[PDB]
Tab-separated table of C-alpha atoms in Angstrom:
chain	number	residue	atom	x	y	z
A	1	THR	CA	117.286	87.618	284.103
A	2	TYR	CA	117.275	84.554	282.464
A	3	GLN	CA	119.784	86.527	280.079
A	4	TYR	CA	123.041	87.487	279.908
A	5	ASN	CA	122.382	91.181	279.847
A	6	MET	CA	123.691	92.583	276.323
A	7	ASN	CA	123.501	96.653	277.342
A	8	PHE	CA	126.210	97.560	276.953
A	9	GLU	CA	128.128	99.656	273.667
A	10	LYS	CA	130.208	96.780	272.347
A	11	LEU	CA	128.933	93.285	272.186
A	12	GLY	CA	132.657	92.584	272.663
A	13	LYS	CA	136.284	91.410	271.107
A	14	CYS	CA	136.809	88.069	269.133
A	15	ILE	CA	140.202	86.738	268.785
A	16	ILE	CA	140.705	84.384	265.892
A	17	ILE	CA	143.694	82.407	265.469
A	18	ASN	CA	144.006	80.701	262.361
A	19	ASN	CA	147.124	78.393	262.629
A	20	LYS	CA	148.066	76.966	259.081
A	21	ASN	CA	152.084	76.757	258.563
A	22	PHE	CA	153.923	74.513	260.945
A	23	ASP	CA	158.165	74.348	261.472
A	24	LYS	CA	159.433	71.682	260.097
A	25	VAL	CA	160.134	69.809	263.682
A	26	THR	CA	156.375	69.493	264.590
A	27	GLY	CA	156.209	66.828	261.819
A	28	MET	CA	152.536	68.419	261.377
A	29	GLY	CA	151.179	69.110	257.725
A	30	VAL	CA	149.519	72.185	256.019
A	31	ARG	CA	145.724	72.917	256.655
A	32	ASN	CA	144.519	73.621	253.514
A	33	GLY	CA	140.990	75.008	253.934
A	34	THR	CA	141.680	76.909	257.578
A	35	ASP	CA	142.022	80.474	255.432
A	36	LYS	CA	138.608	79.535	254.029
A	37	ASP	CA	137.348	78.563	257.076
A	38	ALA	CA	138.980	81.999	258.765
A	39	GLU	CA	136.994	84.439	256.287
A	40	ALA	CA	133.653	82.754	257.060
A	41	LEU	CA	133.833	83.439	260.931
A	42	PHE	CA	135.597	86.729	260.358
A	43	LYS	CA	132.427	87.596	258.453
A	44	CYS	CA	130.141	86.001	260.694
A	45	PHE	CA	131.332	87.121	264.314
A	46	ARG	CA	131.226	90.865	262.595
A	47	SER	CA	128.118	90.456	261.553
A	48	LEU	CA	126.973	89.738	265.179
A	49	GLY	CA	129.192	92.667	266.515
A	50	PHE	CA	132.358	91.400	267.586
A	51	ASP	CA	135.174	93.428	267.054
A	52	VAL	CA	137.393	90.751	265.316
A	53	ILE	CA	140.836	90.469	264.711
A	54	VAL	CA	142.714	87.596	263.416
A	55	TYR	CA	146.278	86.581	264.287
A	56	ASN	CA	147.976	84.028	261.604
A	57	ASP	CA	150.730	81.544	262.268
A	58	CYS	CA	151.163	81.822	265.868
A	59	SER	CA	153.202	80.297	267.802
A	60	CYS	CA	152.449	78.866	271.513
A	61	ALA	CA	154.065	81.773	273.817
A	62	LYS	CA	152.892	84.214	271.300
A	63	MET	CA	148.808	82.256	271.514
A	64	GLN	CA	149.587	83.131	275.334
A	65	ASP	CA	150.158	86.546	275.044
A	66	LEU	CA	147.487	87.498	273.040
A	67	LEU	CA	145.466	85.682	275.379
A	68	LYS	CA	146.760	86.951	278.638
A	69	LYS	CA	146.990	90.434	277.003
A	70	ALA	CA	143.111	90.599	276.144
A	71	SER	CA	142.400	89.013	279.308
A	72	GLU	CA	144.386	91.957	280.575
A	73	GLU	CA	142.364	94.800	278.514
A	74	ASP	CA	138.926	96.303	279.452
A	75	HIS	CA	135.709	94.846	278.848
A	76	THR	CA	133.484	97.096	280.913
A	77	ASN	CA	132.043	98.165	278.144
A	78	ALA	CA	131.284	94.574	276.353
A	79	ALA	CA	129.089	92.464	276.850
A	80	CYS	CA	131.434	89.227	276.627
A	81	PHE	CA	134.358	87.846	275.129
A	82	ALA	CA	135.117	85.004	272.253
A	83	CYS	CA	137.940	83.539	270.914
A	84	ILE	CA	138.434	80.973	267.847
A	85	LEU	CA	141.612	78.423	267.748
A	86	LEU	CA	141.876	76.997	264.295
A	87	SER	CA	145.029	74.315	264.441
A	88	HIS	CA	146.465	70.767	264.915
A	89	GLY	CA	145.075	68.909	267.899
A	90	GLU	CA	145.375	66.212	270.373
A	91	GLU	CA	143.665	65.280	273.659
A	92	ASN	CA	143.479	68.648	275.806
A	93	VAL	CA	146.378	70.472	273.808
A	94	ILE	CA	146.643	72.502	270.737
A	95	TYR	CA	149.562	72.899	268.357
A	96	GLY	CA	151.596	76.355	267.521
A	97	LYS	CA	153.412	76.778	264.797
A	98	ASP	CA	156.332	75.582	266.817
A	99	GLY	CA	155.143	73.663	269.447
A	100	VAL	CA	151.955	72.384	271.764
A	101	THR	CA	150.031	74.436	274.505
A	102	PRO	CA	147.676	72.749	276.445
A	103	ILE	CA	143.837	74.304	276.343
A	104	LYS	CA	143.701	75.064	279.815
A	105	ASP	CA	146.779	77.517	279.810
A	106	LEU	CA	144.980	79.710	277.151
A	107	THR	CA	141.528	79.866	278.679
A	108	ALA	CA	142.728	80.087	282.221
A	109	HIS	CA	143.746	84.160	281.864
A	110	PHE	CA	140.001	84.483	281.607
A	111	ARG	CA	138.917	82.969	285.166
A	112	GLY	CA	137.151	85.429	287.103
A	113	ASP	CA	139.939	86.048	289.747
A	114	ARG	CA	142.343	86.678	286.604
A	115	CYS	CA	139.819	88.993	284.847
A	116	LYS	CA	137.406	91.215	286.808
A	117	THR	CA	136.044	93.420	283.881
A	118	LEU	CA	134.850	89.926	282.350
A	119	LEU	CA	133.111	88.937	285.680
A	120	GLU	CA	129.447	87.564	285.246
A	121	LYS	CA	129.849	87.754	281.507
A	122	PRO	CA	130.141	85.164	278.920
A	123	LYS	CA	133.232	83.774	277.860
A	124	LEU	CA	133.467	81.666	274.404
A	125	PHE	CA	135.954	79.656	272.940
A	126	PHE	CA	135.529	77.388	270.067
A	127	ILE	CA	137.684	75.074	269.388
A	128	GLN	CA	138.392	73.424	264.937
A	129	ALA	CA	141.168	70.811	265.744
A	130	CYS	CA	141.848	67.275	265.873
A	131	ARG	CA	141.436	65.418	269.587
A	132	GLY	CA	143.225	62.005	268.962
A	133	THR	CA	143.466	58.929	266.300
A	134	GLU	CA	139.983	57.695	266.602
A	135	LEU	CA	137.707	58.479	263.677
A	136	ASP	CA	133.702	57.507	263.658
A	137	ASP	CA	132.599	54.206	261.576
A	138	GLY	CA	128.929	55.368	262.020
A	139	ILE	CA	125.408	53.464	261.790
A	140	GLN	CA	121.848	53.793	259.981
A	141	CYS	CA	127.521	90.382	299.939
A	142	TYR	CA	127.789	87.085	298.386
A	143	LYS	CA	130.974	85.513	296.162
A	144	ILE	CA	130.375	83.891	292.503
A	145	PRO	CA	132.569	80.354	290.972
A	146	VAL	CA	136.084	81.470	289.335
A	147	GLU	CA	135.342	78.701	286.798
A	148	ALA	CA	131.685	79.737	285.864
A	149	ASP	CA	130.374	81.791	282.738
A	150	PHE	CA	132.851	79.781	279.998
A	151	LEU	CA	131.423	77.939	277.201
A	152	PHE	CA	133.528	75.437	274.507
A	153	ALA	CA	132.194	74.090	271.104
A	154	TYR	CA	134.767	71.745	270.264
A	155	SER	CA	134.462	70.269	266.717
A	156	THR	CA	134.768	66.914	267.932
A	157	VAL	CA	134.608	64.777	271.024
A	158	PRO	CA	138.034	64.018	272.732
A	159	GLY	CA	139.799	61.599	271.471
A	160	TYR	CA	138.652	62.110	267.662
A	161	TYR	CA	139.531	62.959	264.307
A	162	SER	CA	138.107	66.398	262.685
A	163	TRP	CA	137.198	66.755	259.565
A	164	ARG	CA	138.499	69.424	256.918
A	165	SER	CA	138.092	69.382	252.989
A	166	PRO	CA	140.514	71.342	251.297
A	167	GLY	CA	138.596	73.169	249.260
A	168	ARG	CA	135.137	73.681	251.357
A	169	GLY	CA	136.916	73.933	254.692
A	170	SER	CA	135.953	72.527	257.946
A	171	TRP	CA	132.616	70.589	258.488
A	172	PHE	CA	132.000	72.524	262.280
A	173	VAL	CA	132.524	75.797	260.466
A	174	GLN	CA	130.535	75.413	257.126
A	175	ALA	CA	127.750	74.355	259.407
A	176	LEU	CA	128.710	77.008	262.147
A	177	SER	CA	128.818	79.669	259.602
A	178	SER	CA	125.612	79.139	257.748
A	179	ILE	CA	123.699	79.029	261.146
A	180	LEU	CA	124.754	81.626	262.274
A	181	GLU	CA	124.698	83.854	259.511
A	182	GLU	CA	120.594	82.476	259.088
A	183	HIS	CA	119.814	82.723	262.832
A	184	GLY	CA	122.682	83.886	264.568
A	185	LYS	CA	119.964	86.688	266.160
A	186	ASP	CA	117.288	84.767	267.291
A	187	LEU	CA	118.527	81.984	268.634
A	188	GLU	CA	120.165	81.004	271.831
A	189	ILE	CA	123.847	80.156	272.286
A	190	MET	CA	122.483	76.245	272.850
A	191	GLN	CA	119.739	76.069	270.006
A	192	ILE	CA	122.350	77.312	267.555
A	193	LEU	CA	124.964	74.973	268.747
A	194	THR	CA	122.751	72.413	268.965
A	195	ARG	CA	122.025	72.800	265.530
A	196	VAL	CA	125.731	72.656	264.077
A	197	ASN	CA	125.826	69.252	266.271
A	198	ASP	CA	123.067	68.377	264.110
A	199	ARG	CA	124.061	69.832	260.940
A	200	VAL	CA	127.521	67.969	261.099
A	201	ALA	CA	125.911	64.915	261.962
A	202	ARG	CA	123.198	63.794	259.449
A	203	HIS	CA	124.533	65.820	256.181
A	204	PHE	CA	128.578	64.857	256.372
A	205	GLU	CA	130.286	61.609	255.459
A	206	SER	CA	133.771	61.211	254.489
A	207	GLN	CA	135.001	59.984	251.446
A	208	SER	CA	138.884	58.308	250.518
A	209	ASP	CA	140.827	55.625	248.103
A	210	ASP	CA	141.685	54.596	251.909
A	211	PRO	CA	139.204	52.584	252.953
A	212	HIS	CA	140.438	53.080	256.508
A	213	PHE	CA	139.441	56.739	256.031
A	214	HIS	CA	136.457	56.142	253.760
A	215	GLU	CA	132.795	57.015	255.160
A	216	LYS	CA	133.716	58.347	258.630
A	217	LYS	CA	131.898	60.375	260.765
A	218	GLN	CA	131.834	63.245	263.163
A	219	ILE	CA	129.690	64.793	265.739
A	220	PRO	CA	131.411	67.996	267.645
A	221	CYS	CA	130.903	68.384	271.488
A	222	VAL	CA	129.902	71.500	273.974
A	223	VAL	CA	130.947	71.975	277.347
A	224	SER	CA	128.832	74.486	278.896
A	225	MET	CA	129.233	76.072	282.627
A	226	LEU	CA	127.082	79.278	281.221
A	227	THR	CA	124.349	80.582	284.161
A	228	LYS	CA	121.778	82.120	281.568
A	229	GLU	CA	120.576	82.259	278.237
A	230	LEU	CA	122.742	84.148	275.667
A	231	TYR	CA	121.377	85.724	272.734
A	232	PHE	CA	123.544	88.091	270.373
A	233	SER	CA	120.667	90.752	270.607
A	234	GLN	CA	118.539	92.888	272.309
B	1	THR	CA	112.247	69.395	263.222
B	2	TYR	CA	114.089	70.553	265.947
B	3	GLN	CA	112.651	68.293	268.770
B	4	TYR	CA	113.897	64.921	269.533
B	5	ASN	CA	110.560	62.796	268.525
B	6	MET	CA	108.264	62.253	271.861
B	7	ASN	CA	105.923	60.069	270.667
B	8	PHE	CA	106.521	56.352	272.426
B	9	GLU	CA	104.608	54.432	274.676
B	10	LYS	CA	107.090	54.929	277.306
B	11	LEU	CA	109.316	58.051	278.550
B	12	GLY	CA	112.054	55.605	278.878
B	13	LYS	CA	114.322	53.363	281.746
B	14	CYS	CA	115.972	55.600	284.364
B	15	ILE	CA	118.770	53.761	286.408
B	16	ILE	CA	119.798	55.747	289.603
B	17	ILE	CA	123.316	54.147	291.262
B	18	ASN	CA	123.331	55.257	294.843
B	19	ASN	CA	126.561	54.401	296.365
B	20	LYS	CA	126.442	55.291	299.965
B	21	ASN	CA	128.759	52.575	301.866
B	22	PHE	CA	132.489	51.869	300.325
B	23	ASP	CA	134.786	48.897	301.143
B	24	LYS	CA	137.213	50.410	303.765
B	25	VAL	CA	140.044	49.168	301.621
B	26	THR	CA	139.215	51.895	299.115
B	27	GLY	CA	139.838	54.550	301.641
B	28	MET	CA	136.321	56.074	301.136
B	29	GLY	CA	134.437	57.415	303.585
B	30	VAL	CA	130.446	56.513	304.018
B	31	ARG	CA	128.631	59.564	301.729
B	32	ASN	CA	125.916	61.118	304.108
B	33	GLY	CA	122.956	62.861	302.505
B	34	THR	CA	123.122	60.607	299.277
B	35	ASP	CA	119.838	59.141	300.373
B	36	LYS	CA	118.054	62.268	300.417
B	37	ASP	CA	119.339	62.574	296.649
B	38	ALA	CA	118.499	59.247	295.313
B	39	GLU	CA	114.996	60.120	297.375
B	40	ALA	CA	114.837	63.772	295.392
B	41	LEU	CA	115.619	62.123	291.992
B	42	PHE	CA	113.352	58.837	291.906
B	43	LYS	CA	110.677	61.041	292.863
B	44	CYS	CA	111.415	64.141	290.036
B	45	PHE	CA	112.005	61.256	287.157
B	46	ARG	CA	108.932	59.388	287.791
B	47	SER	CA	107.303	62.290	287.868
B	48	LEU	CA	108.158	63.052	284.521
B	49	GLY	CA	106.895	59.148	283.256
B	50	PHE	CA	110.753	57.691	283.558
B	51	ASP	CA	110.136	54.038	285.077
B	52	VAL	CA	113.219	54.544	287.799
B	53	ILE	CA	114.920	52.166	289.222
B	54	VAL	CA	117.207	52.461	292.138
B	55	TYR	CA	120.387	50.091	292.757
B	56	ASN	CA	122.251	50.540	296.185
B	57	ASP	CA	125.813	50.259	297.010
B	58	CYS	CA	127.260	48.790	293.800
B	59	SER	CA	130.194	47.047	293.292
B	60	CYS	CA	132.316	47.817	290.233
B	61	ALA	CA	131.383	44.463	288.348
B	62	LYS	CA	127.627	45.404	289.153
B	63	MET	CA	127.899	49.159	287.951
B	64	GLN	CA	129.894	47.450	284.616
B	65	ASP	CA	127.164	44.566	284.306
B	66	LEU	CA	124.094	46.485	285.061
B	67	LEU	CA	124.360	49.025	282.613
B	68	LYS	CA	125.560	46.586	279.915
B	69	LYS	CA	122.240	44.853	280.240
B	70	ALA	CA	120.236	47.859	280.138
B	71	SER	CA	121.959	48.717	276.874
B	72	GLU	CA	121.149	45.538	275.323
B	73	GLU	CA	117.261	45.444	276.373
B	74	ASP	CA	115.141	47.325	273.659
B	75	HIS	CA	114.567	50.683	274.000
B	76	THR	CA	112.438	50.747	270.519
B	77	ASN	CA	109.207	51.423	272.383
B	78	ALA	CA	110.911	54.682	274.835
B	79	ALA	CA	111.687	57.989	273.917
B	80	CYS	CA	115.233	58.302	275.924
B	81	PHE	CA	117.223	56.968	278.902
B	82	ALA	CA	118.593	58.317	281.560
B	83	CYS	CA	120.896	57.656	284.178
B	84	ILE	CA	122.074	58.751	287.401
B	85	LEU	CA	125.718	58.078	289.061
B	86	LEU	CA	125.721	59.007	292.633
B	87	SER	CA	129.459	58.153	294.117
B	88	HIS	CA	132.889	59.113	295.089
B	89	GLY	CA	135.076	59.973	292.105
B	90	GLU	CA	138.376	61.284	291.187
B	91	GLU	CA	139.441	62.537	287.417
B	92	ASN	CA	137.599	60.288	284.870
B	93	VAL	CA	136.382	57.665	287.323
B	94	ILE	CA	133.374	56.723	290.220
B	95	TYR	CA	133.558	54.803	292.810
B	96	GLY	CA	132.033	51.445	293.060
B	97	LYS	CA	132.049	49.695	296.988
B	98	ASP	CA	134.689	48.061	295.687
B	99	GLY	CA	137.274	50.661	293.734
B	100	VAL	CA	137.089	52.431	290.743
B	101	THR	CA	135.889	52.459	287.208
B	102	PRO	CA	136.094	54.551	284.082
B	103	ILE	CA	132.764	56.787	283.973
B	104	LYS	CA	134.001	56.261	280.108
B	105	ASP	CA	133.747	52.592	279.923
B	106	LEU	CA	130.144	52.826	281.493
B	107	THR	CA	128.534	55.474	278.907
B	108	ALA	CA	130.054	53.233	275.822
B	109	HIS	CA	127.770	50.361	276.289
B	110	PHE	CA	125.054	52.906	275.108
B	111	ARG	CA	126.910	54.294	271.916
B	112	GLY	CA	125.043	54.407	268.874
B	113	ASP	CA	126.891	50.943	267.196
B	114	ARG	CA	126.357	48.945	270.510
B	115	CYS	CA	122.627	50.106	271.735
B	116	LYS	CA	120.914	50.065	268.276
B	117	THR	CA	117.557	50.533	269.705
B	118	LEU	CA	118.571	54.498	271.443
B	119	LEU	CA	119.562	54.825	268.325
B	120	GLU	CA	119.218	58.645	267.039
B	121	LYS	CA	117.681	58.841	270.965
B	122	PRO	CA	118.933	61.205	273.725
B	123	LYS	CA	121.127	59.320	276.332
B	124	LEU	CA	121.562	61.202	279.335
B	125	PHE	CA	124.026	61.054	282.153
B	126	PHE	CA	124.054	62.673	285.691
B	127	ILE	CA	126.794	62.287	287.965
B	128	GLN	CA	127.678	63.625	291.423
B	129	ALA	CA	131.031	62.713	292.565
B	130	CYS	CA	133.996	64.303	293.412
B	131	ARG	CA	136.597	64.977	290.148
B	132	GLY	CA	139.467	65.818	291.466
B	133	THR	CA	141.046	67.838	294.769
B	134	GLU	CA	141.046	71.410	293.542
B	135	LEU	CA	138.176	74.156	295.719
B	136	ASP	CA	136.901	76.906	293.873
B	137	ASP	CA	138.369	79.851	296.034
B	138	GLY	CA	135.502	82.489	294.748
B	139	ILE	CA	134.914	86.210	293.624
B	140	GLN	CA	132.813	89.126	294.738
B	141	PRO	CA	124.164	56.368	253.738
B	142	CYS	CA	121.261	57.417	252.738
B	143	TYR	CA	123.869	59.219	255.508
B	144	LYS	CA	124.740	56.991	258.528
B	145	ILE	CA	125.198	58.928	261.715
B	146	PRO	CA	128.052	59.126	264.365
B	147	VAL	CA	128.279	56.439	267.427
B	148	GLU	CA	128.503	59.334	269.663
B	149	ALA	CA	125.774	61.611	268.799
B	150	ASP	CA	122.781	62.096	271.325
B	151	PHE	CA	124.523	61.800	274.360
B	152	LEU	CA	124.245	64.795	277.136
B	153	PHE	CA	126.617	64.361	280.551
B	154	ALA	CA	125.346	66.857	283.123
B	155	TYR	CA	128.328	66.966	286.205
B	156	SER	CA	127.971	68.267	289.294
B	157	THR	CA	131.249	70.081	289.059
B	158	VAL	CA	133.528	70.883	286.348
B	159	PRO	CA	136.923	68.743	285.914
B	160	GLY	CA	139.776	68.589	288.032
B	161	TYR	CA	137.471	69.496	291.170
B	162	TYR	CA	135.561	69.121	294.569
B	163	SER	CA	131.762	68.577	295.056
B	164	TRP	CA	129.537	69.819	297.784
B	165	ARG	CA	127.666	67.533	299.805
B	166	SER	CA	125.595	68.079	303.203
B	167	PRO	CA	124.982	65.438	305.154
B	168	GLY	CA	121.896	66.774	306.139
B	169	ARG	CA	120.443	68.050	303.022
B	170	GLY	CA	122.258	65.907	300.279
B	171	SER	CA	124.529	67.283	297.495
B	172	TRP	CA	124.319	71.049	295.813
B	173	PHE	CA	123.571	69.849	292.627
B	174	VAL	CA	121.080	67.548	293.506
B	175	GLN	CA	119.043	69.649	295.872
B	176	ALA	CA	119.148	72.676	292.531
B	177	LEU	CA	118.768	70.111	290.237
B	178	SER	CA	115.494	68.378	292.139
B	179	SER	CA	113.967	71.298	292.818
B	180	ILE	CA	113.992	72.470	289.372
B	181	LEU	CA	112.523	69.952	287.746
B	182	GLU	CA	109.698	70.149	290.364
B	183	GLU	CA	108.848	73.677	288.895
B	184	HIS	CA	110.108	73.913	285.659
B	185	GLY	CA	110.257	69.813	284.540
B	186	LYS	CA	107.574	70.168	281.882
B	187	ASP	CA	108.010	73.483	280.226
B	188	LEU	CA	112.026	74.058	280.006
B	189	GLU	CA	113.898	72.847	277.381
B	190	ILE	CA	116.809	70.287	279.246
B	191	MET	CA	119.635	73.331	278.570
B	192	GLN	CA	117.442	75.383	279.922
B	193	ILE	CA	116.790	73.149	282.919
B	194	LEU	CA	120.833	72.254	283.157
B	195	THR	CA	121.631	76.184	283.096
B	196	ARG	CA	119.338	77.056	285.714
B	197	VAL	CA	120.651	74.702	288.022
B	198	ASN	CA	124.148	76.245	286.854
B	199	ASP	CA	122.474	79.331	287.740
B	200	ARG	CA	121.293	77.881	291.489
B	201	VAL	CA	124.376	76.149	292.412
B	202	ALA	CA	127.092	78.884	291.717
B	203	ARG	CA	124.556	81.608	293.065
B	204	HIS	CA	123.335	80.228	296.062
B	205	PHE	CA	125.454	78.132	298.100
B	206	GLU	CA	128.886	78.318	300.015
B	207	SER	CA	130.754	75.954	302.234
B	208	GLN	CA	130.711	76.736	305.936
B	209	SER	CA	133.764	75.088	307.503
B	210	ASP	CA	135.949	75.180	310.455
B	211	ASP	CA	139.201	73.605	308.574
B	212	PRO	CA	139.311	77.503	306.685
B	213	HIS	CA	140.978	75.251	303.723
B	214	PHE	CA	137.378	73.895	303.240
B	215	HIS	CA	135.516	77.276	304.025
B	216	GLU	CA	133.791	79.413	301.956
B	217	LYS	CA	133.976	77.479	298.955
B	218	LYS	CA	132.190	77.723	295.466
B	219	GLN	CA	130.980	75.273	293.063
B	220	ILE	CA	129.976	75.158	289.421
B	221	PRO	CA	128.267	72.184	287.636
B	222	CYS	CA	129.675	71.232	284.046
B	223	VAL	CA	127.403	70.007	280.760
B	224	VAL	CA	128.549	68.303	277.717
B	225	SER	CA	126.315	68.247	274.721
B	226	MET	CA	126.651	65.988	272.099
B	227	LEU	CA	122.458	66.309	271.580
B	228	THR	CA	121.315	67.188	267.883
B	229	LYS	CA	117.698	68.289	268.787
B	230	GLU	CA	116.255	70.109	271.392
B	231	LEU	CA	114.498	68.226	274.309
B	232	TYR	CA	111.367	68.641	276.207
B	233	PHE	CA	110.073	65.819	278.798
B	234	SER	CA	106.495	65.854	276.774
B	235	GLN	CA	104.548	65.468	273.805
B	236	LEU	CA	102.237	68.761	274.005
B	237	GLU	CA	102.286	70.929	271.088
């Protein structure tokens, strides 16, 4: 009872949204590497015992639909819920195939008052997406809150670039997959994420022929309203 | 290693800004109960080995200039840095007695490229302040390092929302935080402490009121971590 209870026949559902190809309109490039990230994250979360489903090139509306529908499914026998968004991004919103939807709109479906079978259960959103212009230069009888029990792990701090090598995928995802691969079952969620932060920070530096992009850095950003420790075991 | 190094002469500086009174033109009221909070926290933090300084009723320029100076001091002999803001707030912004300033402008002074002596060390911010008007109704090289690394913010509430404070006991967040650093200040990791605070505030507080719009409300704090190691306030081992 300092831990979330994992005594359920399922760990839970994990939805991957892998947005790669974008409608001409949006003016957004192709995200080479995302398929590599998605595969990695499929195996990872499978290892934990998540029932993982991947949906490719979803528009908004579709994104809302998935998340709304799952919000409405029955989670009684599930320990927790997890969704993963891989897309383009700017502050507070993310890209569909056809436009942008704001994150709060996706997640809100799961608020305690809007999804009872997930009440008092962790809800996890992992989000690899740009968050703005910035780039990093570097240096050497009782109730419970409806907003409680969420955790977001963003690829990056608000207002920043998110790096992704076309041939190896996200820095963040490379990191997060390895760490889960090796420690997913014996580290608390905040430990795992702190290691990702550390690994993305130390061992990664961007290179480009453009000096404006050469030798940039990155740090992921974890937002937590969990109320217990979370382990993916016992 | 996996822990932040704690073998320094001092644990570090701990600045507490205690904004209780405000100029009438800001339309902001006396923050009754805030002195309880500052008291409980200067006790807690001193108790951990912080050198704590308590400022009162600051202007926006004072908050800005204060924190700028702190970041320009020499932290070489210090393991970490902590700052605690107790004021009125709105999304993105905390009040001086003067008016309003961007939380983000306050903390930027400590970015890696502007505060070299705190490079690779945890810079902690704790914030008790309304973050919006929404109410929780409830329910039954060799490599460099990024300049935004090693920050942790612990907001007393989630963005967009209200923060509860008792004229009599002080704010829900600070009661809980302070009470938990008593018991487990020295044996729990920082994210463990703060998770327990989340648990405490969620599970064990509910707003009693006459105006049924402010009646039976709930609260959940919000922790944003950029930390890159585990953090305990002791060398031990």
